[PDB]
Amino acid sequence: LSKGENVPYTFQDEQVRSNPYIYKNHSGKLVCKLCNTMHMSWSSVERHLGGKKHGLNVLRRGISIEKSSXXXXXXXXXXXXXXXXXXXXXXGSVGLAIQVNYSSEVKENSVDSDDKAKVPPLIRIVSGLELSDTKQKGKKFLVIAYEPFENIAIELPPNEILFSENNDMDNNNDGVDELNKKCTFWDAISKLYYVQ
Amino acid sequence: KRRKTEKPSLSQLKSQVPYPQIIEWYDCDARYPGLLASIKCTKNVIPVPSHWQSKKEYLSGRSLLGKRPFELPDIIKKTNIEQMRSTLPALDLDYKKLHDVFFKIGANWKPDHLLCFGDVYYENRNLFEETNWKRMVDHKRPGRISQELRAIMNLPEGQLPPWCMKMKDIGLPTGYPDLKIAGLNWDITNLKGDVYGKIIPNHHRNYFGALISFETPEFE
Amino acid sequence: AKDDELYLYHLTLKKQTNFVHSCIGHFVDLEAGSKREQSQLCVATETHLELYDTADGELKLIAKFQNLFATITSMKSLDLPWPTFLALTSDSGNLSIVQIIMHAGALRLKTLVNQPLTRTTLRRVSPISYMEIDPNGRCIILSSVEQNKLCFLVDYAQKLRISSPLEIIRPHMVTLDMAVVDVNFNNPCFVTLEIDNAATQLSVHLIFYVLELGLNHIVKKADYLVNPSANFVLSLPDLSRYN
Amino acid sequence: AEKQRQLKLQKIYKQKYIGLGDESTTREQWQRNVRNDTLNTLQGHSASLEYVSLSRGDLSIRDTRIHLLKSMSPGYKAYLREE
Amino acid sequence: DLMFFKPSDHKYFADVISNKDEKKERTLSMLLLKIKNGNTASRRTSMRILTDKAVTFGPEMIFNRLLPILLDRSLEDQERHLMIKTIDRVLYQLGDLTKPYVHKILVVAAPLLIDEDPMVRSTGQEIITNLSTVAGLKTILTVMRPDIENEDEYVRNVTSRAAAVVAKALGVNQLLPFINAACHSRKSWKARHTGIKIVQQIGILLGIGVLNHLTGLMSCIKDCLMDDHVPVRIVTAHTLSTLAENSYPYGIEVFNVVLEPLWKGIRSHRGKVLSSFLKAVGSMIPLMDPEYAGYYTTEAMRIIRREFDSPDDEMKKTILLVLQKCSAVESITPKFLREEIAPEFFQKFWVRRVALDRPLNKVVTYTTVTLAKKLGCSYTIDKLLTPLRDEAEPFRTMAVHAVTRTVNLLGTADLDERLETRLIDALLIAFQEQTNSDSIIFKGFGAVTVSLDIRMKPFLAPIVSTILNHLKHKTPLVRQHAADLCAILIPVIKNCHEFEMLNKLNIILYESLGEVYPEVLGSIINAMYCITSVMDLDKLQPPINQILPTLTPILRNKHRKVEVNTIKFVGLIGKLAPTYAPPKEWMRICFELLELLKSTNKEIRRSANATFGFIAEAIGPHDVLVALLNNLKVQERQLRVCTAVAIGIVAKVCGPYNVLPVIMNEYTTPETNVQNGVLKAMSFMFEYIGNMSKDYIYFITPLLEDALTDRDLVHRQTASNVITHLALNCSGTGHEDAFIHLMNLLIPNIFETSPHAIMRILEGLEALSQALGPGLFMNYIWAGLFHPAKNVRKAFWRVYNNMYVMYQDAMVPFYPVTPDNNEEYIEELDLVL
Amino acid sequence: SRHQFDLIMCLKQPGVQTGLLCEKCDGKCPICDSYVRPKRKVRVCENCSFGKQAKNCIICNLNVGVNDAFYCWECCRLGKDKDGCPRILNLGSNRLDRHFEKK
C-alpha cells in the first residue's frame, strides 16, 4: 500500500516527497505534522489523507502561507474507440483538435430506454498523480468518456494550449463545466465527438 | 446552589495568604479555600502540574513530533558499540573495557541536566535546549568570540570589535566592571586569537569529607 | 571531579538508657548444672536490650545482647506449663517470641516464632504498644492504641505453636492501658479503657473482655462508663475469700 | 471491573488503616486523622514521649502519654475547660 | 458478525429482524445477542458497551429481556455463562433493584450452585453474593419464605444453598432469626428440613468462621433434632457432622447439649438413622474432652465392631469415618487396636468387592492410613502384604495407595527384613503385572524406594531388570510409566554406588531417545535429566557432548512435555557442562529456543528463558544478545516479552556492564515494539539484580528521559515499570537526586487514565516514596492534595491513600499543618527544651 | 492479582499457617507474580485453611499445592508482605471462560 515510497523519519534532517507531511517520529508510528495526528498503518494514513480533517488543516496552512506572504448501473464493455488527433492552428496561437468516432448502430440496437441516452460524451482534465499502478506521473490527460465505450486519454505536456480568454459572451448554462460547453461538439446524428 | 454562591472572592482569599501570587481564580471553588491556600502556599510544597484542565491527555505536543529519538551518554558512546551495531536505518567487546566504562571511567560521571527540587516537566518543555544553554553559560564568557560568529561579523583577526570604540566613549559595561579589553584597560599585545579581553577578578577546604583517595571495585 | 559525598560511619558508643519494658522470667541457667529459680529480669529500651540477675540481693549484668535494630514497643515474659522465654512485640507488627540461649561461649538471643501483624512502622492500627500475657501463659494478647485487638492462643509442644489470631475490631474506640486479670484456668479475661475517637463529648469508658476458650473468640462482657478523668486499670487477683 | 475492585480495596484499607482520604473528605474528618497520627507517634515513641514530658514539665511522663491519648478525642478540649 | 446464529432463541428475541425507548430497546437486545450468539471480537465489544451503558438502560427491560433467556433448555454451558457474566456485571453496576426482579434473578441463577462443576458453582455463588448487597436482608428474607414452603425437593435444595450464600454474604447474624423461623417452624415439615440444611451449607461455606456464630445454630440443632420425623432427625445428625468438622475441637462446650440425645438415638433407632448419628458422634470425637473422649469412644467402638457386617454402603462409609476420627484418641491404646479393632478391620473391609467402587475406596484408604498412625507400621503393612499379590488389578491399585499414604507419613523403618523383602517383591509383581493404565504405581513405588534406600541394593538390581524389561514393550502407556519410574529411582541408585549401572541406564535410554511417541519420549528425557543430574559428568557414558546434538532436533517436536523435560535437561547441561558442547552448537540452541518460546506453555516458556542464563554463562553474552535483539523486532507479544526476560536473565548472570550498553542502542532503534522490549528487558534485568543497579542508575536516567517524555502511554507505562524495580532496589543508595529527576518526569503522568497505566504509575510513585522518602514525594502530594477539580483530587488521593498505607509515622513530621492552618492543631509540637 | 483484575483477595490478619501453591504456580510472589529473590513464606488466616480448601493453590485457587509461597524482596519492602491474607476467592473470568471454552 506504500507504493514503495520511502518516508524519512522526522529526526533525519531533510529527493522530493510526494506529500511532505506524513512522517515517522522518533518512534515507529506515522504522523501528520500539520494535523498532529498519529496513525498506526499506512491504510489509516490514507484514511487521514482522504478525510476532511487533514484537508481543513491543509487549507489553514495555505492561509498561513498567504499570511506570511447512476454510478452503479454504469454499463461497461471497455471497448477502445478510434481517436483522430490533429495539430490545429488559428488566430493567435496553436490548439489541439480530436475527432472521436462511435459505433455504427451495431450494438446500440439493444439499449434504448432513455437512460442517459440523451447525455453526450464528457471530457475532463486529470492529473497523473493518481493511477491504478502509481509508478510514474507528472503530466495531464484529456480524458473522454461515454457510458458503454471505454475511457480514452491524451497526454498534455504543454502547460497550456488553446486555453482561451472569454471566447463567447458569458452565457451561463454550465452543462458540466466551462471546458465542455466552451470547446466541445457532439454530432449525435453521426456519432462524432469533436474536442478543441 | 447556595454553597456555590457562598464563595469568597479570590482577592478576599489573597489577604489570608503570605505568598498571594500562587492562588488562582479556580481556588474560589475550593471546598476549603482558606485551608487550600495555606497548603498550596506552604513553604516547600510544589504546585500541581498545570496540564490538568486541558483535555489533550497531557501530550498532544507539536514539539513531540520533533524530539530526537535518543543520544548515548558520551561515556557509553566511548564503548564503540555504536559502530559495532547500527541502530539507525558478533559485536563482542572486552569485559574490562565495558566494566571500566561504567566503573573506572564512569563512577564520577553523572547526567548533566537532571532537575531540581520543584522542577516539573510541562508538555511544551524540552530539556535539551536548556542543557546546551547551561553548558553555554559555562563555556562562553565576555571578551571572547568564536571564529564562526567572528566570520559572520566579518571581523578580521587582530582587530577589536566595533563596540570597543563606542565603549571608549560610553565606558566599560556596567554589568562587567572587571572586564578588560585590549587597547583600552588591557594590554593590546596580549590580544590573541578569539580573545580580545578577559575579566580580571579583584577578589584575590576538604569539606570534612575529602576522600583523598578514589578506588573503584575491580572486575578481575 | 572529586565527588564530595560525605560518607559517615555511625557508631553507638553508649546504648539507650531509658528502660521502657521489663519481664520477670527465668531465661538462662548459667554457672549452675541444675538450678531453677524465678528470680531474674530482662529489661529493654527500644533497640537496646539487657538481661540482669540478682540471686545475691544485688543486681548483676548478665549479658548485653546484640542490637535488634527495631523499636520494641512492648515486652512481656510468658510462663507455660520449662525455661521461661519472653514474648516481644516491636515495629513490623511481628509478634516475636524469643528465648535467651547459651550458644558457643556467650549468651545469644534466639527467636522461636514471629507472627506478621499490621505493617512495618509505628502505627495506631498496629497491634503493639499495648501487650500482656495470661499469668498462666495460655494466651498472649496484643492490642492497638485505636483500631483493633488481636489475641493469640499459645500452645507448647515438641515445637512451639502459636494459634491463629483472635480478632476484635472496634472502629472508633481508642484503647489505652491494657491490663489482664489472672484466672484459675477458667477463661482468660483482659480489661481495657476505651476512649471514643469520634464523639461530641469526651467519654472514657472501661470495658471487660472474656476470651472464651470454648467458642474461640473474645467476648465483650461489661461496658462501664466512667468519668473522662480515668487513668489506668489494675487486676485484683481473686477475692475468693470475700464476695 | 478494575476501578470497581479499587472501591472494595478502598473499603478494606479504610477499615484497617482508619482514615484514608478517598475523594471528598471534609477538613474536619481529615485534620482529625492528622492530629490522631501525630499524637499517636508522639506517645508511641518512648523517645518523643520522654521529650514532650520534659519540655512540657509534667510531674510524670505517663501524664503526658495519657494526655495525648485523651487529646485524641475532640471533647477533651472542653473537658480541660471544665476543670 | 452475529457468528453462530441461534434460530429458536433468535426467533425468541424477535425485536429487530431487519423513539428513544425503541432505540435503547432494540440496541440492548442486539447487544445481548452479540454476547450470547456472536463473534468473540464482537461479544468483547458488546460487553464493554453493555457495561458502560448498563446504568442508562432500564433494569426493567434489561432483566425483562435477559432473564427468561436462561429458562430455555437449548442453552449451553458456554452461552449460559456468557449471559451469567452480564448478569453479574449489571447487578454489580446498578446496585439497586426492586424485590420482584430480585426474586426473578435469584430464581434464575439459583440452580447454578447445584451444578456438578465448581466452575459453575463459583459464578452461581458470585451472582448471589453480589445480589445480596443490592436487595438487602429484608428483601431476600421475603423471597425465601414463600419458597421454603414449596413441595419441590429440587427447588428446596436449590434455595437451601442460595439462602446459605446470602447468609454468608450479608452475615449470618442478620439472617439468623430467619434461620430460627424456618428452623423452629411448627407449620411445615419441609420447612423444618430445608431450614436444617441451610445450617449445613452455612457451616460449609463459613468453615472455621462458624465458631462465633455457632450458638444460634446449635439451638436449632438441639430443639429441632427432637422432632419425631426420621428425615429431620437424620439431617440434624449430618449438621452435627459438618458443624463439628468445620467446628474444630473448640465448640465442645456448646455441643455438650446435643451430645446426650445422640446416644439414646443410637441405641434405639439403629438403621440409617444410626448411620447419620454415628457420623455426628464420630465428628464429635475429636472435640471431646480427654476423659469424655475416653468414655464415649469406648461406648461407640462396641457398636462399630458390631456393625462391621453392615451390608449397606452408607453405613460402612460412616463406620470408616468414625474409626478415622477415633484413631486420634489417646485413650484407646494401639495395643487395644491391634488386639481387637485392627484384626477385625483388615479381614472385613479389605474384601475384593470393597475395591470395586472408587468413592468408597477413598474412605477405605484414608481410614486405613489414619489407623497406621496408632497401629504399628510393620503390623499395618504386614496386613497389607496379602492384598498386594491379589490378582485383581484395581484391588492392587488400592493396595498400592494404602502403602503410598502410609509410607509417606510413617516410613518403612518399622518393618523387619523378611516382610520388607515380601513388600518389594509384591511391589515388583503388581508393577510388572499391571493391566490398567494409571499413574499411581510408579509414584508410590518411588515413594517406598525413597523411604528405604540403602536396603534396596539386592532388590535394586532386579527392580532395574524389570525397569529395562518394561523399557522394551509394545504399549506406550507401560513405556512412559516405566520411564517415570526410572526418573524417580535414579536418585536412590546413587546411595548404592552403582554408578556404572546408571551408565548403562543412560545408554539404553539414550538409544531409545529416538522414539516416535512424544508422550514417552518426554519421560525418557526426564530420566536422562535425573541421571545426568545425579551422576558426575566425566563418567557419563554417551557422553554429554554426544547427547546434546541429538537433543537439538528434539525442540521442534511440538506437543508440550517433550519441550518441558527437553528444556529442563538442556538447562541441566547448560549449568553443569559448559565445556563439552561446542559454542556454535550452543548458538544453534539459542536459535531453536528463540523460535521455540512462541509456545503457549508458561512452564516451557519460563524455563526456556531461564536456560539463557546458563547459555550466557557458558557462551558469549553479546553472541546471545545479537539473536535476542534481532528477535525483539517480531510483532508477537510473547516473543517480545520473553525475549526481554531472556535479556534480563543474561544480564543477571553476565552482569549489566555487558548487556546494558547494547540494550541502550537497541533503544536508539526507532521501532516502537523494539523500544518496549528494551524498556521491559531493562525492568527485568534490574529486578534480577538487587545490589548491582546502584552503580548503573545514572546511565539509565538519560534513557528514561526520552521514555517518560515519549507520547506513547505504552513507553510511559513500561518506563514506570523500570522505575518501580530500579527505585525499590536502589532506594537508600544516595541517588535520590537522580530519583528526584525521574519523579519530576512522572508527576505529570498521574492524571493519565487506563488501568494498566494508572497501576504502573501508582507502583512507580510508591517505589519513589522509598527512594526519595515521603517528604518531597509528600510535597507534591500536598500541593495537589485537595484542589477544586474533583478529578485532580480523585487522582492524587489515590497516591495519598497508598502513601498512608505504606507510611504513617513516616509522614507525621511532614504534615503541612500550622496553628493558623487548623483550629486545634497540636499544642505539644511547639514545645522546645 | 497484579495481572488479572477481577481476582479478589482475602486481606485478614495472617495466622501461623503457611499457604500452599501448586508446582504449576511455583515461584510466583502471590502479589506481583514475580520469580526473583523470594523472602518470607506466605501466611494465611485460619479462615482460609480449615478443610480441603487449605490444600488449594493460594494463587490459582484450583490445584492442590505442595510448595509454600514466598513474597519477593520488592513486596517485602513495599510492605504488601504484611498487608493481609493473600488468597484468590473468585476463580476469575479468565479461568471461567477457559473452562467453558474447552467444555
Ligand SMILES: [Zn+2]
Ligand atoms: Zn493531516
Ligand SMILES: [Zn+2]
Ligand atoms: Zn484469608
Ligand SMILES: [Zn+2]
Ligand atoms: Zn496454582
Ligand SMILES: [Zn+2]
Ligand atoms: Zn512480590
